[PDB]
Design a protein around this nucleic acid. Structure first.
Ligand SMILES: Nc1nc2c(ncn2[C@@H]2O[C@H](COP(=O)(O)OP(=O)(O)CP(=O)(O)O)[C@@H](O)[C@H]2O)c(=O)[nH]1
Lengths: 136, 133, 23, 313, 95, 37, 126
RNA sequence: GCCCCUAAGCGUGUGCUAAGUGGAAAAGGAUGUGCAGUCGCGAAGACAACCAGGAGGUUGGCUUAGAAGCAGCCACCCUU
């Protein structure tokens, strides 16, 4: 499942949520795509889930792209512990997704089935997202 | 109006002939008896009989040439039809004999128009899978 | 949880102008 | 969910007797990114954290899991209604492991079940309807892998399989032609049906034998195991082959409850014989004429419906 | 069809652009071979209308306040959430 | 009557309707009939 | 309705009536395909017995040049374009009033003109 | 803040709401309702319904005794 090979610093602050996306805000690989509309931390798990959803929906066709890689690590203190004595170990790899960013992109000869698979992916994702298209 | 397609042979076979004649009306035998009596001379050709029934009963002795697809089969040179028409064609049946034999059968079915008959027979050949030239 | 929800939502009034002490 | 719960319970209960020592040793450095033993799902995903970390949490979760399996037993027996309500013969593919059970199922039924290279590939017993030589829309189910010295710490997983084998009639015993002691393989895997019947005693079901991997197996075995050895039939290859008499002897050894007493079907309605033709097979359709006379088998209700009309030939 | 009116910008800046975009007048800047930048405004409705059919590249007859002038669409700064053009950059053409 | 926050026509014959301020799906097949509730 | 059909609707009657010295119009309803063909195709030797839209052909009639029979199109119409021969055509149209009785001649265009209540029978009673 | 409790508007003009929404809440579901756009059709007759046909080839070919259009699979044309 998606994961960085290595990261320079293992314990980083949480990725910021403020502001809109000034980059990655257009379909530039495939024909359709999922444009988010709400700040969130999309995680390796959700990305894998949506990818499997789209691939299972489209039968051995089309090409899929992911314009976001989970690289920011989020820690977690071990259970049943007081507050203090250092940050927790890395727990979840998250990609800071911002309003307007295109998360998934698809290119499939058909139209209805591409739309349907994209809807599947959106449902699997946490955030509110719409289906944008290369046309405009 | 019940049509049974059959040749001039045979006599009361249930799986192909268990019709309303045996269900309700005259005995089962008389139907085929009176049907084959006036058309024994068929020799394998299919001569379907279309019987009518009135408020109580009214036998009718009616006939017709074999199906269009079956005539195509007879002339083509095969006994079994192809289950994959336009995927594996068997024979390229020509049009001269088709015309000479359909110049009256289609005049009875719909009309004697040679072009219309040609288009209909082309459709039937396409259906069977043994198309024409 | 009802008491907390209510005390917090009390901040959305025309008189507090949106902020309440100890929200 | 069934697997992710029952395997989780088995793991918790295996920890139970050794919650002290090595479990703490594992948790000490934790997985360290990823450990050599995951959790409820093992292959990443859920179960990423650990198995046993606190005795309280472990006990709590074993309780919850036991309740969950209580729920799943009801769900499973509800699902398994139609077959028991219909009295439809069922057969079970009983193989030790990697004996190509799923592949054999794909064969003979056109099924498309997964067939992966591993000693434990098929997770839950899956089944499909099949046809015998003449009909009998019977049922065929696989079994989950059984390895020597069946770990009793993991029975909740094989409990469903055990039920599905004890609620069946004819058993077909698949072996794998890899090891040198297939006799040991078969005896070992058969040691389990003994306790299966001990618990859920109904009867010793009729038995049949088969061994997959024919193409690659017996490379130096020759047909000794095919002639001298007792009951066994095998043509499947390590990828798939043709099936010749596995589907004939399977029908001849399955329950023959279907009565074969001759019945007389008259003409009567326009297609009254259609009922018998579609129900009870049409074996020996000695069609004659008019009120066609024939000889075919029929089930209990059709036999009782035609009783009065059963005039001797 | 390709004839789009225009109106020079009375003011310019954050407030002027915001007010214009609220009233539905996409701002634009016209410059190029003539080498004399002009800040103007167009009706976003007709601008998008012509853009739908003629595509991003197109030779637009910009009817300026006082005369006409040919132009070419160079840039379209568009908001990614609200799919609406925020600013247009037109390249004059000398023919 | 499946009470579910998510009601969608399961089959081509299923028709949605608003009744007593409460969305309900009704079909010729009784099994598909459901309500939002 | 359809634009192409409308466009052809001129020629759909123009040459037909230009050639046919006579044509019939009547409220047709009931005769199956077989009954209709019994005279349309089964007896096709000197007249094309067809039908056409009675609402779209009202303008097409004016276009073709006929104007006497325009108020009689308000309802089903069964046209019979003959190439002139009337002694057999009148008999053909009068034959159906024994077996079906569902086929009368409400009117039509005789010799580029209209007709009366008795002309329907007097076209050719010989 | 201005119906009475309670000092002061049951204020005036446009609209909106049927939910007591106002007078708590998410993913998601949704033939509720106002408005601004678009694409088909339609006064040469459409959208609903009503009167007749909806045919011949032909039980179209594979399958099946069977499959006539209706378990299922290929073709899926024309005569008027
Ligand atoms: N012996 C045999 N092996 C096969 C056959 N078809 C595929 N295989 C190979 O065997 C491997 C294991 O699959 P399989 O033996 O079917 O699994 P199984 O024995 O049915 C169930 P489990 O693996 O849990 O014991 C697969 O990787 C496949 O490539 C076959 O017909 N016979």
């Amino acid at each position: 499942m998606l994961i960085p090979r290595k990261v320079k610093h293992r314990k980083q602050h949480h990725p910021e949520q403020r502001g809109i996306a000034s980059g990655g805000t257009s379909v530039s690989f495939g024909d359709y795509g999922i444009q988010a509309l709400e700040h969130a931390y999309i995680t390796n798990r959700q990305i894998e889930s949506a990818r499997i959803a789209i691939n299972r929906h489209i039968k051995r066709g089309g090409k899929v792209w992911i314009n976001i890689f989970p690289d920011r690590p989020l820690t977690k203190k071990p259970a049943e512990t007081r507050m203090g004595s250092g940050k927790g170990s890395p727990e979840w790899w998250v990609a800071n997704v911002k309003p307007g960013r295109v998360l998934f992109e698809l290119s499939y000869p058909d139209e209805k089935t591409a739309r349907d698979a994209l809807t599947r992916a959106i449902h699997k994702l946490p955030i509110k997202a719409r289906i944008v298209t290369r046309e405009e | 109006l019940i049509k049974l397609q059959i040749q001039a042979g045979q006599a009361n076979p249930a799986p192909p002939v268990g019709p309303a004649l045996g269900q309700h009306g005259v005995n089962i035998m008389e139907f085929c008896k009176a049907y084959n009596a006036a058309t024994e001379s068929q020799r394998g050709n299919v001569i379907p009989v279309e019987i009518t029934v009135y408020e109580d009963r009214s036998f009718t002795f009616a006939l017709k040439t074999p199906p269009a697809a079956k005539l195509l089969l007879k002339a083509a040179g095969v006994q079994k039809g192809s289950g994959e028409p336009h995927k594996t064609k068997v024979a390229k049946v020509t049009w001269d004999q088709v015309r000479e034999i359909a110049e009256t059968k289609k005049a009875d079915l719909n009309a004697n128009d040679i072009d219309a008959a040609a288009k209909i027979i082309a459709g039937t050949a396409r259906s069977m899978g043994i198309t024409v030239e | 949880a009802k008491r907390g929800r209510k005390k917090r939502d009390r901040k959305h009034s025309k008189a507090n102008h949106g902020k309440r002490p100890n929200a | 969910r069934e697997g992710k719960a029952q395997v989780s319970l088995a793991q918790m209960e295996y920890m139970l007797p050794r919650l002290r020592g090595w479990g703490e040793s594992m948790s000490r450095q934790a997985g360290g990114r990823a450990g050599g033993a995951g959790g409820g799902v093992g292959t990443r995903g859920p179960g990423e954290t650990k198995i046993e970390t606190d005795r309280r949490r472990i006990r709590e979760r074993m309780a919850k899991l036991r309740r969950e399996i209580r729920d799943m037993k009801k769900i499973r027996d509800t699902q398994r209604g139609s077959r028991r309500r219909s009295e439809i013969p069922s057969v079970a593919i009983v193989g030790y492991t990697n004996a190509g059970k799923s592949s054999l199922l794909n064969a003979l039924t056109g099924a498309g079940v997964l067939v992966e290279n591993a000693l434990f590939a098929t997770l839950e017993p899956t089944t499909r309807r099949g046809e015998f030589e003449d009909g009998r829309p019977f049922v065929l189910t696989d079994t989950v892998g059984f390895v020597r010295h069946l770990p009793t710490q993991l029975v909740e997983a094989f409990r469903s399989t055990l039920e599905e084998v004890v609620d069946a009639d004819l058993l077909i015993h698949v072996v794998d032609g890899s090891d040198v002691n297939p006799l040991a393989q078969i005896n070992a895997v058969r040691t389990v049906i003994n306790e299966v019947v001990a618990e859920y005693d109904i009867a010793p079901p009729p038995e049949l034998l088969v061994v997959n991997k024919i193409d690659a197996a017996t490379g130096v075995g020759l047909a000794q195991l095919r002639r001298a050895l007792p009951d066994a039939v095998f043509v499947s290859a390590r990828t798939g082959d043709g099936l010749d008499k596995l589907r004939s002897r399977m029908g001849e050894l399955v329950e023959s409850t279907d009565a074969t007493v001759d019945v007389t079907i008259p003409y009567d309605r326009g297609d009254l014989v259609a009922r018998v033709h579609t129900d009870g097979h049409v074996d020996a359709t000695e069609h004659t004429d008019a009120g066609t006379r024939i000889k075919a088998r029929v089930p209990a209700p059709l036999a009782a419906t035609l009783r009065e009309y059963a005039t001797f030939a | 069809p390709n004839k789009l009116t225009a109106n020079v910008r009375t003011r310019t800046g954050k407030g002027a652009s915001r007010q214009a975009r609220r009233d539905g007048k996409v701002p634009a800047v016209l410059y190029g071979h003539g080498t004399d930048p002009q800040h103007l405004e167009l009706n976003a409705r007709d601008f998008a209308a012509v853009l739908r059919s003629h595509g991003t590249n197109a030779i637009l007859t910009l009817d300026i306040e006082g005369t006409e002038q040919l132009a070419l669409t160079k840039a379209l700064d568009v908001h990614p959430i609200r799919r609406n053009i925020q600013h247009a950059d037109l390249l004059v053409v000398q023919r | 009557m499946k009470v579910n926050p998510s009601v969608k026509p399961i089959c081509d014959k299923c028709r949605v309707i608003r009744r007593h301020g409460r969305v309900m799906v009704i079909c010729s097949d009784p099994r598909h009939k459901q309500r939002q509730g | 309705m359809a634009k192409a059909d409308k466009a052809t609707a001129v020629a759909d009657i123009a040459e037909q009536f230009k050639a046919s010295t006579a044509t019939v119009v009547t409220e047709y309803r009931g005769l199956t395909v077989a009954n209709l063909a019994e005279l349309r195709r089964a007896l096709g030797d000197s007249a094309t017995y067809t039908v056409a839209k009675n609402t779209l052909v009202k303008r097409a009639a004016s276009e073709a040049g006929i104007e006497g029979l325009d108020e009689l199109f308000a309802g089903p119409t069964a046209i019979a374009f003959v190439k002139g021969e009337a002694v057999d055509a009148a008999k053909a149209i009068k034959k159906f009033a024994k077996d079906n009785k569902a086929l009368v001649i409400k009117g039509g265009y005789m010799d580029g003109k209209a007709l009366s209540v008795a002309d329907v029978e007097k076209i050719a009673d010989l």
